[PDB]
Design a binder for this molecule. Structure first.
Ligand code: HEC
Ligand code: HEC
Ligand code: HEC
Ligand code: HEC
Ligand code: HEC
Ligand code: HEC
Ligand code: HEC
Ligand code: HEC
Ligand code: HEC
Ligand code: HEC
Ligand code: HEC
Ligand code: HEC
Ligand code: HEC
Ligand code: HEC
Lengths: 506, 220, 506
């Protein structure tokens, strides 16, 4: 059986820029040569960026297989790590019938006896006699079923945890920010997209508690904020309020497939809703049933007035328009209804999720109307300063040099090669760069107003509507979306008013 | 085996590879990892060793140093170095000695005579309880039960200027060894560099066995 | 032994305006004559502003030492206060070996027997036979060690709790807001900066629980919000999520020096991280190890393009540029590493805190670039309205009258005396007035955009980075900082565009 490989079914160019171990001497992705990795990428993305220790040589403890000395020293050097490890199922893997049962199957799969899982097992590289940061590939050596079900996130595409480090550094405005001296301004980015090679991200480090991985709080350090208020929308919903006040009577020791709805959980968790796969079957990843995925990709069931009618502009990389009523998504919706039907009527659940669809249709319509206003100003040459007197699209030189029509299609790449990126890019997926980085008069004021409309307030109302939080739905969502439309119209009228004066002054 | 007086190239390398990261490149207890380490690694340049068979203020014998290297120091990152060979541990003894001028001018005092450990009884334990709590008031630094939470505990300091709050010894992991002879040795020799003095003068040989028996009684 | 004095080593002019008891008839600080105190300052700052009761005379109960009548009446008048007090260690000070031990030492220090600590002990002024709000000076009469360690906050300077009421009323825009009728708009200010004379601020009133003082929630009523999101950044970090879900197994009955890292706390608290002093020694104040203190003072390790290159402009009061790599701050960083090393490797901890430094260097650089844009508009006379046709700096008449070159230096005071404050003040520490008060066209729109950049979004990303919360670091921090830079550039281009028309109209 092939050893666990996180980069299975990936081309050699992709593994050369994402898996092959550079030090901190280089970046990652197609623009790896345009920036250098942040220091903590040793720990966030070990395969690509980890470097060996430099202070105390650990080789002699590995070379003579002195597992005991790892504990004797770190018992006093880092007592917290040992206290976690001594309390984990890795130290006591045969202490309960459940633990003894899962351990027995693992012993057969690895051909070894496992009375304990030691620091040596996770950290000691035997061939090179060096200390190692264990990626998911090491964990998959024993937990092969969980590794493969995690690997199945590739089947639905981005966004997901498997390809999390890809999305971080593949966008061109990451390297551009590092070019201008703001590499470490993206500190939270590398820390939040680190769930690609680290399996300690939900069930945290050295306790590795399935109980902790199953409670909703394990996801809330990452899933919060203006572009995905998942923690706030769930936590403040009736589902979350009941969980927070009845958590003592929730049995988190039971795996999800054994959880009796109503008796073990009164209200569902993030893991119960999202790790459900279909037809009473659960899976060790939360992304299989996504439909409106992030709330950014426009649905194909709408007729747009802006250039969204031509999205995704022949770009092979980014996702095409989502068909909400496709056979695949209707089945996905039915899988959701199987979850909700355990505590609600099908009618009440289907009526609610149909309202989620209606909110998203009108929200994407509202965003399209705002994008039409911004693009008409561009077409009328009222953008000030114009594309000629402002910085180009972020990393336009690297896009031309590193990408091709194989990535972006002929019309999109031809414009970059011909105009060297001296044109505006507005709207879903690739127009969001201004959310992250401000270059010389690029973006303008009105472009980031629209950006906040479709990437902040549409997404907050989306997550509030989907997670049954009425305040997040309206007051973090629709109402701020209407307010940016107010600012966009006033700015459009302001730019036309100024131009109407610059003409009658000639 | 035989511990050399001469410094060797092997002794330099063993110290470099296995001791310098903590104790420093020149034995000043100022390796990089010493900034975040507690207890701090020993500064060998002062010639002050906690664990000896020699009286208070004296240098350690070459055997005292070799013993601490082999056994390690519990309640600290000082692991046993039984992983190293007999000769390797012996070749670094002069390297540690070369860090302090005191080793070149003075000779280590003669080792004390342990004698025969007295038989612990209900009588000897209560005589040690009286010394511990009334005659010498050890609960000042160590507390009534030896938990290290006495009134004067938090304010104690090294001769190197570092806080040395007496660790809870009710676990039985004494830094110099958990033997009744080891604990008796500490009370007979004192811990050089720390506010823990020698009681060889305040107490007789028998009274320090009484005290040792009561200290062992506080273990769980 | 001198009686406890919160104002030790303070000049007579400072005690005359901060300690001497005016009623509610006056203010406090150098501008005490320019405003009057809010009503609740009787309770927030008792020494300066408390006044005796006026309804029910309490003198007869004090004059005949009727401690029993205090309880008999307030048992029914204010049952909550008695219920707290009956449950506190002050009512039962010899109920546990720990309480009995600390009580015995206090009995020796005060020469009295303490079978209970009564309302009489904390509230009854014996000389004047009146009821008193006990300041920290009364508490220090028994808890002298804690009072002195709290008094040691003076060694690092502002910000801190000891000088909290100073910072509140010493700034000129406090009295100016009161001049214009917005005194009580600063209701939260007096309430949050009340931790200078009130020791019930972490361990709350009449229960005075050390258990409550040690849990993180005791600090979160004050340490939250846009200029210091400490509660959100910690609470939503893995440190806080693990604490909130494992709090039942945290032993808050143990003092911090007895807390075993890993076994008693799995993750640290605000008190564990901040009340650690050095080398395994703890202290009863959280401010001793601050380096980047608030995130506002510019570091000296940067070359600035705006007037930050001349900060602090010869002003004696405000703090000078922080040397991140000074001998003092490197030692402070090492004390932090001693905390983190208890549950992390030195490398992982040092790598992370070095990333905190890198984030702050690039964030202060980003703020300096924005300040250059604003100041160039001022130098080019494009600020509309100009300093001549708008209100002066807040309380410019009081600054000239009450301050001198001893406070602000000759060049800064000379400009105030000559120009009567009719000039802009932009950037760190003294330019933040527009954050608090809006005068007649002062500040302008772009000045408060920059103010939100360096006083809101830089600080939120700072606290998110320092407290290991990736969302607060990027989405509350860097990304909004870039967005204000977008607004600042568009406004600068807007003001230059308008001026380019007002010239070709002559
Ligand atoms: C005392 C001599 C130790 C022994 C024996 C072991 N470890 Fe260690 N370890 C120790 C220290 C003081 C440090 C910090 C090093 C630094 O540069 O700060 C470490 C570090 C580690 C790490 C972290 C690696 C990283 O990149 O952060 C790991 C994963 C680790 N140690 C594991 C480990 C193993 C498997 C051991 C037995 C072979 C072992 N350690 C022994 C102290 C000591
Ligand atoms: C072989 C030595 C393994 C390595 C490599 C990893 N794990 Fe493990 N783990 C192993 C066993 C035999 C057990 C006990 C039986 C069981 O599977 O439950 C475990 C336990 C866990 C658990 C659950 C423990 C609990 O809930 O108390 C988790 C969540 C877990 N392991 C995760 C995990 C991670 C993240 C790993 C990479 C760092 C990893 N395992 C490696 C065996 C082995
Ligand atoms: C935790 C708060 C994160 C921070 C900090 C950053 N990212 Fe992220 N990102 C995060 C989540 C949870 C999601 C998906 C949310 C959902 O409901 O789908 C995303 C999404 C993206 C995307 C688009 C999705 C994709 O194409 O894969 C991109 C391109 C992306 N993130 C990149 C990115 C950058 C450039 C960041 C800072 C420089 C950054 N992320 C920070 C989680 C978090
Ligand atoms: C049942 C009430 C759920 C709870 C509990 C959680 N989520 Fe959820 N989520 C749910 C639905 C029905 C949807 C919309 C699905 C659709 O596309 O039609 C979502 C959406 C998300 C997403 C976007 C991915 C997607 O499925 O479209 C994310 C990233 C997400 N939710 C995160 C999340 C978190 C962090 C939760 C715990 C705080 C959580 N969800 C709980 C249903 C339910
Ligand atoms: C009075 C105490 C009730 C008892 C007895 C039962 N239900 Fe109920 N139900 C009640 C209320 C106040 C509501 C909400 C009304 C509204 O307009 O919102 C409901 C709703 C339902 C639903 C609707 C869908 C859903 O919320 O899941 C269903 C399917 C439902 N109730 C089922 C149900 C069953 C099976 C009962 C017997 C065990 C039952 N209800 C009793 C009030 C009351
Ligand atoms: C199995 C044949 C059932 C019997 C017997 C009862 N109920 Fe029912 N109920 C059942 C299903 C499968 C559904 C879903 C219907 C849908 O359109 O999705 C329901 C629905 C309800 C509801 C919800 C009504 C709504 O508007 O959502 C309620 C309040 C309800 N049922 C109550 C109810 C009562 C009072 C019953 C005894 C007379 C009863 N149900 C029997 C399945 C079955
Ligand atoms: C303050 C001046 C102390 C007095 C009084 C007593 N002890 Fe002590 N002791 C003190 C310190 C600072 C230390 C070293 C702690 C460290 O971390 O190095 C000690 C040490 C001990 C030990 C441990 C011996 C070992 O090998 O680990 C013991 C058993 C001990 N002390 C006992 C003891 C007795 C019996 C005392 C009264 C005669 C006594 N101590 C007083 C500080 C102080
Ligand atoms: C002399 C009568 C005192 C006055 C004046 C103050 N305190 Fe007190 N306090 C006193 C004693 C004898 C004790 C019990 C022993 C001990 O120190 O713990 C206390 C207790 C406390 C505690 C801890 C109680 C607990 O955790 O259960 C706190 C936090 C405390 N005291 C604070 C405090 C404050 C804020 C005071 C001013 C209002 C104050 N003390 C005054 C004795 C006396
Ligand atoms: C609680 C939410 C507060 C409110 C309301 C006000 N202040 Fe404050 N202030 C508070 C904190 C916790 C801090 C420091 C945060 C940090 O991480 O350092 C501050 C800081 C100041 C400062 C600058 C620091 C100094 O020079 O001492 C000033 C000048 C200040 N605060 C004054 C002030 C004013 C004028 C307020 C409203 C009118 C006000 N504060 C409210 C806590 C809180
Ligand atoms: C360990 C993970 C900590 C926890 C738990 C808390 N804080 Fe913290 N804080 C920590 C560090 C390493 C720093 C940066 C120190 C530096 O200057 O380099 C901070 C910063 C602060 C500050 C600013 C003062 C300063 O030290 O610079 C404040 C006011 C602050 N933190 C408050 C705070 C609160 C309220 C906490 C509980 C919710 C808290 N901190 C926890 C480390 C840690
Ligand atoms: C024991 C009380 C700890 C102290 C002291 C410090 N940290 Fe910690 N931290 C601790 C645990 C048990 C965890 C969970 C591990 C995980 O898988 O997340 C953490 C987490 C962190 C992280 C995030 C780790 C990640 O993989 O994302 C960081 C960046 C971190 N801690 C930093 C940190 C710093 C700077 C500390 C000193 C101020 C520190 N930690 C102390 C436990 C403990
Ligand atoms: C598999 C279940 C592991 C066991 C057994 C041990 N560790 Fe671990 N370690 C593991 C993971 C998944 C990680 C994070 C990897 C990443 O890239 O983020 C770590 C990390 C560490 C570190 C790094 C610094 C830190 O986070 O504090 C250290 C110092 C460390 N681990 C120490 C350590 C010790 C002493 C162990 C034996 C008790 C041990 N680890 C076992 C996974 C596993
Ligand atoms: C930080 C690591 C976390 C942790 C603790 C959780 N999530 Fe996940 N997640 C994270 C990122 C950076 C991304 C997107 C990566 C990318 O851009 O490619 C995701 C993605 C998801 C998704 C997919 C959303 C979609 O399809 O649009 C889901 C459904 C999801 N995350 C759920 C989820 C759950 C249930 C968690 C707790 C068990 C959880 N996340 C934790 C980062 C992180
Ligand atoms: C309201 C009173 C609170 C309480 C409950 C806490 N803090 Fe403190 N704190 C408060 C103020 C108003 C200030 C600044 C005052 C000024 O401007 O001079 C502070 C300051 C701090 C600091 C210093 C920050 C720095 O150095 O830049 C720290 C480190 C701090 N506070 C920590 C802290 C902790 C750990 C608390 C819980 C025990 C806590 N604060 C509570 C106001 C208040």
């Amino acid at each position: 059986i092939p050893p666990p490989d996180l980069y299975k079914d990936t081309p050699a160019w992709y593994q050369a820029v994402y898996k092959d171990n550079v030090g901190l001497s280089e970046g990652s992705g197609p623009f790896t040569k345009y920036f250098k990795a942040q220091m903590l990428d040793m720990y966030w993305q070990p395969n690509r960026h980890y470097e060996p220790m430099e202070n105390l040589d650990h080789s002699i403890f590995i070379e003579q297989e002195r597992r005991d000395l790892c504990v004797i020293c770190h018992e006093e050097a880092t007592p917290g790590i040992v206290a976690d490890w001594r309390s984990s199922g890795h130290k006591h893997p045969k202490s309960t019938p459940y633990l003894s049962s899962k351990t027995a199957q693992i012993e057969k799969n690895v051909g070894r006896v496992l009375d304990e899982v030691h620091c040596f097992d996770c950290h000691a590289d035997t061939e090179k006699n060096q200390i190692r940061m264990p990626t998911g590939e090491v964990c998959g050596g024993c937990h092969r079923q969980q590794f493969d079900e995690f690997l199945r996130e590739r089947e639905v595409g981005r966004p997901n945890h498997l390809q999390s480090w890809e999305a971080n550094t593949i966008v061109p405005w990451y390297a551009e920010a590092a070019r201008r001296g703001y590499l470490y301004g993206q500190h939270g980015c590398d820390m939040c997209h680190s769930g690609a090679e680290k399996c300690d991200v939900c069930h945290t480090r050295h306790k590795f508690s399935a109980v902790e991985g199953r409670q909703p709080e394990a996801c809330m350090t990452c899933h919060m904020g203006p572009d995905h208020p998942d923690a706030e929308s769930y936590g403040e919903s009736k589902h979350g309020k009941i969980y927070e006040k009845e958590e003592e009577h929730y049995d988190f020791t039971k795996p999800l497939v054994e959880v009796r709805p109503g008796e073990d959980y009164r209200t569902p968790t993030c893991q119960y809703c999202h790790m459900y796969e279909k037809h009473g079957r659960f899976i060790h990843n939360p992304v299989m049933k996504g439909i409106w995925r992030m709330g950014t990709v426009p649905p194909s069931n709408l007729e747009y007035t802006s250039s969204l009618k031509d999205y995704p502009y022949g770009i092979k990389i980014i996702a095409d328009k989502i068909d909400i009523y496709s056979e695949e998504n209707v089945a996905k919706r039915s899988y959701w209804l199987e979850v909700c039907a355990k505590c609600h009527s099908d009618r009440f659940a289907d009526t609610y999720l149909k309202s989620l669809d209606q909110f998203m249709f009108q929200a994407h319509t509202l965003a399209d109307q705002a994008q039409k206003i911004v693009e008409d100003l561009i077409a009328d040459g009222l953008l000030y300063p114009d594309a000629a007197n402002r910085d180009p699209y972020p990393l336009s030189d690297g896009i031309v040099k590193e990408l091709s029509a194989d990535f972006l299609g002929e019309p999109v790449y031809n414009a970059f090669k011909t105009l060297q990126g001296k044109f505006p890019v507005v709207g879903p997926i690739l127009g969001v760069y201004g959310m992250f980085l401000q270059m010389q008069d690029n973006p303008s004021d009105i472009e980031n107003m629209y950006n906040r409309l479709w990437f902040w307030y549409k997404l907050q109302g989306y997550k509030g509507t989907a997670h049954a939080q009425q305040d997040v739905s309206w007051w973090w969502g629709q109402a701020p979306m209407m307010m940016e439309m107010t600012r966009i119209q006033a700015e459009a009228a302001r730019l036309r008013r100024l131009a109407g004066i610059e003409k009658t002054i000639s | 085996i035989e511990i050399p007086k001469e410094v060797t190239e092997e002794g330099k390398n063993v110290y470099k590879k296995y001791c310098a990261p903590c104790h420093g490149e020149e034995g000043g207890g100022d390796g990089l990892l010493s900034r975040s380490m507690l207890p701090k690694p020993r500064n060998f340049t002062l010639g002050a060793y906690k664990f000896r068979t020699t009286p208070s203020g004296s240098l350690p014998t070459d055997e005292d140093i070799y013993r601490t290297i082999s056994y390690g120091v519990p309640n600290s990152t000082m692991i046993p170095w039984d992983i190293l060979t007999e000769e390797q541990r012996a070749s670094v003894v002069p390297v540690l000695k070369s860090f302090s001028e005191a080793f070149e001018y003075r000779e280590p005092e003669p080792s004390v005579d342990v004698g025969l450990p007295l038989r612990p009884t209900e009588r000897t334990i209560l005589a040690g309880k009286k010394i511990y709590e009334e005659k010498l008031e050890c609960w000042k630094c160590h507390g009534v039960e030896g938990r290290g939470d006495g009134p004067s505990a938090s304010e104690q300091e090294d001769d190197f200027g570092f806080p040395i709050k007496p660790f809870d010894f009710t676990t039985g992991k004494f830094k110099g060894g958990n033997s009744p002879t080891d604990v008796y040795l500490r009370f007979t020799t004192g811990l050089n560099g720390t506010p823990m003095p020698s009681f060889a003068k305040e107490l007789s040989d028998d009274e320090r066995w009484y005290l040792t028996h009561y200290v062992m009684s506080l273990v769980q």
